[PDB]
Ligand binder design. Structure first.
Ligand code: SF4
Ligand code: SF4
Length: 55
């Protein structure tokens, strides 16, 4: 799983780009569904602040 850390500025750019729709808007920051994430790294590639990190 990747997890979006506290650097997220809630820009929303990563949500459309997840190939398996694992990202949604949450309170404070966006959230990854760890039961769907397949570690592709796409969200980190479109993140301006590089908040998604592999855990
Ligand atoms: S790593 Fe890939 S599968 Fe996991 S949330 Fe980011 S874009 Fe979606
Ligand atoms: S692209 Fe980065 S800052 Fe923008 S919502 Fe996704 S994780 Fe947060």
């Amino acid at each position: 799983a990747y997890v979006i850390n506290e650097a997220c500025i809630s820009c929303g750019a990563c949500e459309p780009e997840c190939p398996v729709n694992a990202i949604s808007s949450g309170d404070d920051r966006y959230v990854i569904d760890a039961d769907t994430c397949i570690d592709c790294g796409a969200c980190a590639g479109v993140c301006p602040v590089d908040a998604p990190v592999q855990a």
